[PDB]
Design a protein around this nucleic acid. Sequence first.
DNA 1: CAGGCATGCCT
DNA 2: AGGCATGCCTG
DNA 3: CAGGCATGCCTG
DNA 4: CAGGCATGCCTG
Lengths: 199, 202, 201, 201
Amino acid sequence: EFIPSNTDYPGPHHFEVTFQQSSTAKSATWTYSPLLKKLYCQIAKTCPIQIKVSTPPPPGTAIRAMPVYKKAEHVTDVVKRCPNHELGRDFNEGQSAPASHLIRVEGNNLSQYVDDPVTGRQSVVVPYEPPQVGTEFTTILYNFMCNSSCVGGMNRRPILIIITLEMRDGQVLGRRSFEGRICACPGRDRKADEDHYRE
Amino acid sequence: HHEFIPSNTDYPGPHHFEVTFQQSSTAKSATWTYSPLLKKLYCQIAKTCPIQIKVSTPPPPGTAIRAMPVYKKAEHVTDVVKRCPNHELGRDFNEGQSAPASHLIRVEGNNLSQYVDDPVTGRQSVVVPYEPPQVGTEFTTILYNFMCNSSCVGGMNRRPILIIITLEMRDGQVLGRRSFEGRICACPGRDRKADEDHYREQ
Amino acid sequence: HEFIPSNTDYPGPHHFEVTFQQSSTAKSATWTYSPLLKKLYCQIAKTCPIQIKVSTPPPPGTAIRAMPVYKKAEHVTDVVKRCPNHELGRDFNEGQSAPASHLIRVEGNNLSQYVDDPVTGRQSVVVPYEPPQVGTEFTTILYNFMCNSSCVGGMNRRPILIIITLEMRDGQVLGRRSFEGRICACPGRDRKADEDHYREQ
Amino acid sequence: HEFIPSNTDYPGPHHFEVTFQQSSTAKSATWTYSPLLKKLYCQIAKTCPIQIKVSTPPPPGTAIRAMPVYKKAEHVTDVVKRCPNHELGRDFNEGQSAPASHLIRVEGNNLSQYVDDPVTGRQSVVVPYEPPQVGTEFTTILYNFMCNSSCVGGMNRRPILIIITLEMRDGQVLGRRSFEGRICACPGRDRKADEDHYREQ
DNA sequence: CAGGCATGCCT
DNA sequence: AGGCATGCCTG
DNA sequence: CAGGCATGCCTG
DNA sequence: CAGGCATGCCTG
Ligand SMILES: [Zn+2]
Ligand SMILES: [Zn+2]
Ligand SMILES: [Zn+2]
Ligand SMILES: [Zn+2]
């Protein structure tokens, strides 16, 4: 799949991706704009994402996160960290994650980082865990290692984050995508975006 | 089983598990005060903090109650809550203590209190078996001590924490869970007054 | 050798002098110099001409060394090098005799030697001293700077000084002049802005 | 066991001077020096440049030892160490050469020798003496101070003096200088507050 | 036991 | 830079 | 933390 | 080529 699909597909387990209530602070670690279906967050901060499933998926089921560029002109490029953050010492000493992936998982020994031999795509996968008793959602901790504005990397090009519920073989059970923007001042760039969504 | 992100989502369960606090002194530098307006416990380091356990139905045998701290804010949720290096290797409240110096929470006056060190999650918790309420008391009282201030550099470093109390069986299946914010400070009455006034301006 | 390179001016026996010709006043001029702030403004990879003058010819085997170093003491111990992005880029790198990490290049002189000091790690570029052409007043050296002063992963908005050292075959210092360096995209803009803030309160 | 090293100001033969350069007036500047109080204000683990001037070049093997001691008499018997928090902590302790437990470290010099005096228990960091470079006035040494002055478990608000000693390879003292040290979060505020009060009294 | 300070850290 | 947070002293 | 400056790059 | 912007990062 040179161009992975971003179509919403709830599927047999009704896969839903939601965000908790976040800070309205100008430079909060992360905020979500329901209006824009757009995640804002800062580089290397913990982003908690919320999944929901109606009926649990099969043993060996898992969650996949792949970034993809928004604009049709740039969809064919694999999304990676820019050279500066990849080679730089920040967040790279003693890390299992390959220094090249844009998306990391936090707080999970069982995270596996996939480098597709055919497509070249990079993505991070964790085995599905059912919510703990009393809890409604399962929470995956995501980190994004580059700014959307990084030159040599994303280079101010918006991306979309594809979360995919898969079967151990690879069979997609559900799919959700949202816009992702890594920036320094999320509260600011959200308010600017919405004020200009008046049109 | 092992969980890396302990959920603090309140869950009463089949036994209607409830965690409440008795009346507390409003004195500035009192040993502990509780703000139900904020579900926030203010207590001093290494002082006796009674907790109230209540259930509508007696729980099964081998049931216990576990007490583990977690950082409130997700940015730090992954960090295991422990003591600061100063107090861990200090000379205070560590001489001859059946408790590991590294644990933040301890139990007072219960020789059945064991301290776990989950080697998979590295998390530290304290487990005591479920004793009923004393005849004529309507609730089970559990004495907790917290051996490191919220502000201690090298450990919590001014990071809020939550205290998760969990009602579980001998194997670890959770039956019920209540959480509340914990602040280990020096002038609990002042800092409860400050917080409560702030929430009241909006 | 010396892990913290000196930047103090030293004319020495030959009155080593370092000057800049007249520069354009354009916002996006390739380079401009501010004698008020002793700062140079230049563009990435653009020819920047520096002018060298001495009163009396130095001995044979004399050289000119150009070395950058951070201005603030909290950063001086770090070596000034290209950012990863420019270093690994195809631009100005394949088909070039300069190491892709050196910040300062010499334009138009194949006798220039790029030095990586094995003990101190400092990077520099050295050219043999040449007397001004006949009837000319100064020896001009064409320098190139390969990172913007703000490049993340390299200079990272940290101010540098460029140190021009007159030295002999062995390396003894015959003279030294220095001046603050700033690589950017609009040198006229940033110069007018710093000269305006020089007259503050 | 007991040492109580001298802090008596003693220039000796080579005219040993220890001075400071122009520092910032900002509240949270990294470091600042009030000649009025002979007192150095600085932030924790930040680069503090020390200027050392002499007259005659000392013998070979002559080195420079920075040792901290407490000011008030009731404390001078106590050894100035790092608090257990910063010593056992990870901050500024990963991948370095200095013992986690020292207060004073030298930044940017691999010849520095951290000394654990087996008799006196005193901790000090010794660097060899290198002369100024061609054209410069002083030898600049770069010092880091690992704890705040207010660290409980360590200094604990007690003021300290830092003893800069020029000394021979045998240990013979060729000159000594001293000044108060304060490691705080806002050196400008506290220096401004310190000078103001003294002037008013 | 509350008033209030010095000083780190947030605003 | 201004001011608040917060351990700890003091009376 | 919110305000506004610092800068590379667009735009016409 | 000058005006203006987008966005990382200080400033008070
Ligand atoms: Zn990047
Ligand atoms: Zn502690
Ligand atoms: Zn660069
Ligand atoms: Zn300390």
